[PDB]
Amino acid sequence: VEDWDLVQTLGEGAYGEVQLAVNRVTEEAVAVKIVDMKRPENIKKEICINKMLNHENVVKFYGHRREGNIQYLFLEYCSGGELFDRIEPDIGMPEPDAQRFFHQLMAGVVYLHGIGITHRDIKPENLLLDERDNLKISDFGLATVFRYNNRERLLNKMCGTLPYVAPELLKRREFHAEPVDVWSCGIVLTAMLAGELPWDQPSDSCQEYSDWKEKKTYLNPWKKIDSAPLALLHKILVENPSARITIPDIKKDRWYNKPLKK
Numbered sequence: 188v189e190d191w192d193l194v195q196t197l198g199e200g201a202y203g204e205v206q207l208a209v210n211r212v213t214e215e216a217v218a219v220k221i222v223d224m225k226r227p228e229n230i231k232k233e234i235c236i237n238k239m240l241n242h243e244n245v246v247k248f249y250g251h252r253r254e255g256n257i258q259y260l261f262l263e264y265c266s267g268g269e270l271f272d273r274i275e276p277d278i279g280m281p282e283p284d285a286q287r288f289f290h291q292l293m294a295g296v297v298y299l300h301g302i303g304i305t306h307r308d309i310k311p312e313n314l315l316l317d318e319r320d321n322l323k324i325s326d327f328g329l330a331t332v333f334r335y336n337n338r339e340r341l342l343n344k345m346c347g348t349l350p351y352v353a354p355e356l357l358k359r360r361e362f363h364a365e366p367v368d369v370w371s372c373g374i375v376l377t378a379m380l381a382g383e384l385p386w387d388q389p390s391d392s393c394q395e396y397s398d399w400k401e402k403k404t405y406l407n408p409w410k411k412i413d414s415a416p417l418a419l420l421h422k423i424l425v426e427n428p429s430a431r432i433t434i435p436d437i438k439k440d441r442w443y444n445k446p447l448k449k
């Protein structure tokens with residue numbers, strides 16, 4: 188119903204819904220996120236961050252119109268759905284698939300970090316798959332600038348999703364953006380490799396979290412994992428963000444570089 192027709196709802200959420208839209212003439216498909224500014228400050232921030240983005244592992248932004256209160260963000264259609272739907276509960280997925288998705292995730296994250304954007308809500312629901320199963324980072328609704336004119340700014344707002352959030356964001360008034368995305372990348376890796384999340388939140392008041400810091404890897408996310416990716420997970424899920432491995436160093440890790448897939 189906007190030069191394009193809207194054909195199936197594709198997802199419905201808080202702000203609004205995402206529809207699949209076609210040209211009835213050219214036949215080109217795209218997704219359109221539909222936010223009712225009544226149901227404005229922050230959709231403005233989202234489209235603004237979107238206009239900066241151009242990368243093969245980031246959902247393409249095509250444009251925006253206003254049409255009443257109704258913003259329509261026109262976005263790359265990802266016909267493979269969500270990474271979340273390739274993770275079999277209690278099982279995960281074959282290790283070579285997990286590794287390729289992890290490579291593509293790191294490529295997307297290094298890119299955002301390079302232009303000073305942090306996504307702040309990396310999780311499998313926000314990692315979409317295209318026609319050839321290429322992973323694309325999706326939904327910049329919580330995204331923000333953490334570097335500008337080459338100067339870093341610390342974050343203070345708590346956001347994201349509790350099982351994915353780094354412990355510093357619950358403990359510190361201000362914290363660096365990049366290690367928080369790294370950590371959330373490690374929780375996604377765990378989910379791909381075990382088919383379960385290790386804890387509700389990285390709090391000292393969380394038993395499963397305490398067990399991990401005590402290195403009880405004979406318990407039940409970790410026991411399904413396998414020594415090579417587990418060793419990478421030991422470097423990512425480090426409580427102190429200044430000792431946590433960085434992306435250039437993840438690129439040097441042994442499992443990250445292990446040949447697995449045809």
Ligand SMILES: CCCn1nc(C2=C(N)NON2)nc1C1=C(N)NON1
Binds near residue numbers: 205263
């Ligand atoms: C299950 C919802 C699917 N979804 N969600 C989004 C999206 C949201 N929810 N916020 O920004 N972008 N975008 C999509 C989507 C795209 N971008 N292509 O197919 N589906």
